[PDB]
Amino acid sequence: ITAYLLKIQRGGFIQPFGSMIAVDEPSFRILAYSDNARDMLGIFALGTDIRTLFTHSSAVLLEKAFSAREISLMNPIWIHSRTSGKPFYGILHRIDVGIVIDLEPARTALSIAGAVQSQKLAVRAISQLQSLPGGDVKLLCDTVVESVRELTGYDRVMVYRFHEDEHGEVVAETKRPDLEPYIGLHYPATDIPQASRFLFKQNRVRMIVDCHASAVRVVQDEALVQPLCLVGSTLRAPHGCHAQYMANMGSTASLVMAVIINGSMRLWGLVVCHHTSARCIPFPLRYACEFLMQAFGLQLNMELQLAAQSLEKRVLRTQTLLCDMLLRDSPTGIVTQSPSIMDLVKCDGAALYYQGNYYPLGVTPTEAQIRDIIEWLLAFHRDSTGLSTDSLADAGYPGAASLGDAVCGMAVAYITEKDFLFWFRSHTAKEIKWGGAKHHPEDKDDGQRMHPRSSFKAFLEVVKSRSLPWENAEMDAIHSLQLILRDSFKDAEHHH
Numbered sequence: 001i002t003a004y005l006l007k008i009q010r011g012g013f014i015q016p017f018g019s020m021i022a023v024d025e026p027s028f029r030i031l032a033y034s035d036n037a038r039d040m041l042g043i044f045a046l047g048t049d050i051r052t053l054f055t056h057s058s059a060v061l062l063e064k065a066f067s068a069r070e071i072s073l074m075n076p077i078w079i080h081s082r083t084s085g086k087p088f089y090g091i092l093h094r095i096d097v098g099i100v101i102d103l104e105p106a107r108t109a110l111s112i113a114g115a116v117q118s119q120k121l122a123v124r125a126i127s128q129l130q131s132l133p134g135g136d137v138k139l140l141c142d143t144v145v146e147s148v149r150e151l152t153g154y155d156r157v158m159v160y161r162f163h164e165d166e167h168g169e170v171v172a173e174t175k176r177p178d179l180e181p182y183i184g185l186h187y188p189a190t191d192i193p194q195a196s197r198f199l200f201k202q203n204r205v206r207m208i209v210d211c212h213a214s215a216v217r218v219v220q221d222e223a224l225v226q227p228l229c230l231v232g233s234t235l236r237a238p239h240g241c242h243a244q245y246m247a248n249m250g251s252t253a254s255l256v257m258a259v260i261i262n263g264s265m266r267l268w269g270l271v272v273c274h275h276t277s278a279r280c281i282p283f284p285l286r287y288a289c290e291f292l293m294q295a296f297g298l299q300l301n302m303e304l305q306l307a308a309q310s311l312e313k314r315v316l317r318t319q320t321l322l323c324d325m326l327l328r329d330s331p332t333g334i335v336t337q338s339p340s341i342m343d344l345v346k347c348d349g350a351a352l353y354y355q356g357n358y359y360p361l362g363v364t365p366t367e368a369q370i371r372d373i374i375e376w377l378l379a380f381h382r383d384s385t386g387l388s389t390d391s392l393a394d395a396g397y398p399g400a401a402s403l404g405d406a407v408c409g410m411a412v413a414y415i416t417e418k419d420f421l422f423w424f425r426s427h428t429a430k431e432i433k434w435g436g437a438k439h440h441p442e443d444k445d446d447g448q449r450m451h452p453r454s455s456f457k458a459f460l461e462v463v464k465s466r467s468l469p470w471e472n473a474e475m476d477a478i479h480s481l482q483l484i485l486r487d488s489f490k491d492a493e494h495h496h
């Protein structure tokens with residue numbers, strides 16, 4: 001199917017800082033515990049009810065978790081072990097077979113006084129985030145990392161945006177000062193498999209408290225169909241590849257949280273936190289930050305919204321311009337009079353060739369150069385109503401590709417077989433700091449690949465003759481001008 005996907009879904013292992021016990025909902029008898037249960041809760045049982053193991057108060061709270069409308073709301077429930085007195089945050093969620101109970105020990109009265117302190121810091125931070133004049137995504141991510149770091153204490157926190165490749169880039173970071181900085185570093189789209197990404201869409205915050213710690217096995221009675229869904233569990237164990245990936249990166253413990261937007265929801269980026277030591281932050285702080293991530297996502301959705309607004313606003317003006325040019329008398333006026341085809345679309349140059357004569361503007365090829373590009377175009381591309389590329393080299397055109405570092409991106413529109421419209425752009429500098437590896441599109445997640453990369457040193461890639469890419473908006477502008485000009489030239493043809 002999809003690589004890794006339920007090797008993680010029903011992994012059958014959890015982390016060492018608490019333990020997960022799944023239970024039938026009307027039996028209240030255990031379908032599954034973990035072999036670290038009976039000691040750290042303070043002792044054992046199997047196929048047993050759970051109200052047995054601590055205060056009848058705690059049973060009041062769990063039965064009232066079970067008949068809640070909306071299980072999700074009562075978390076974090078709080079329990080106290082009869083055999084020990086030990087306090088644990090209980091965190092529940094309903095799955096197929098039943099309900100899952102994650103139990104995280106609380107810290108050792110003295111630090112709940114600071115736990116609430118950082119929860120009020122969390123509201124203050126969400127309101128600070130909403131009190132922000134839009135139109136500045138850099139400022140957004142900066143304030144997000146600063147307040148997540150001051151909330152959680154992690155040594156490194158950053159925002160990691162996904163590119164259309166689903167390869168990612170550290171786009172803002174604040175760190176303990178001694179650590180090497182990962183700002184600017186792009187990483188390969190395969191470091192996070194599409195399985196793990198689409199799975200972040202449902203579960204939105206993951207902590208791992210120590211990678212060098214030995215995971216604990218599940219107990220499942222053998223009657224049950226298979227290892228159950230452990231996606232929802234706070235203390236899920238991590239896949240081995242990502243564990244050694246951490247170890248190699250120098251990140252002992254990490255907190256990493258989705259950043260989501262809703263059109264049917266997609267994953268914009270992550271917020272990722274690194275501790276060089278082991279860190280376990282209590283579930284309240286986790287929940288609060290998840291709200292802060294929600295606010296992140298929504299102020300981003302506002303930035304997107306106004307992107308789209310202003311885009312359609314400039315679409316409107318290129319249509320004022322389309323009319324304006326339908327009014328010029330002769331094709332040459334496309335280039336002749338005030339608003340020319342070099343203003344249709346962001347250009348370095350542009351040109352029209354119509355009937356054996358050359359009408360160019362901006363940075364352009366020669367007459368001989370142009371006719372060679374057209375000889376190539378018709379020789380190979382006779383079936384596509386034009387084309388667009390950001391490197392005539394990479395495209396496959398030999399010749400002026402060599403003779404052009406001032407002309408490297410090209411878009412062209414077939415009017416008829418005889419004559420064409422052209423827009424050109426020069427090379428312009430992209431340097432990319434790759435963090436150990438370049439992203440290879442042809443690579444895609446391999447399920448039984450068991451080992452990760454070894455290094456992460458920066459290295460400059462330099463793309464050496466690329467134009468900025470033609471976006472669909474500029475392509476739409478061109479294509480529609482193409483259509484109206486075919487219409488118009490045969491209107492004139494048949495009038496005369």
Ligand SMILES: *[C@H](C)[C@H]1/C(=C/c2[nH]c(/C=C3N=C(/C=C4\NC(=O)C(CC)=C4C)C(C)=C\3CCC(=O)O)c(CCC(=O)O)c2C)NC(=O)[C@@H]1C
Pocket residue numbers: 004008160168170182187190191192193196206207237238239240241242245254256270272449450451452453
């Ligand atoms: C194994 C051969 C391949 C592999 C698998 C893999 N990766 C993940 C999950 C994550 N990978 C990252 C990557 C990063 N963490 C960082 O700090 C950075 C740089 C800023 C990167 C690029 C992340 C964030 C995750 C999410 C996991 C988490 O919650 O922290 C998984 C899923 C892990 C799981 O058990 O759920 C897997 C299977 N990664 C590789 O590199 C190999 C190609």
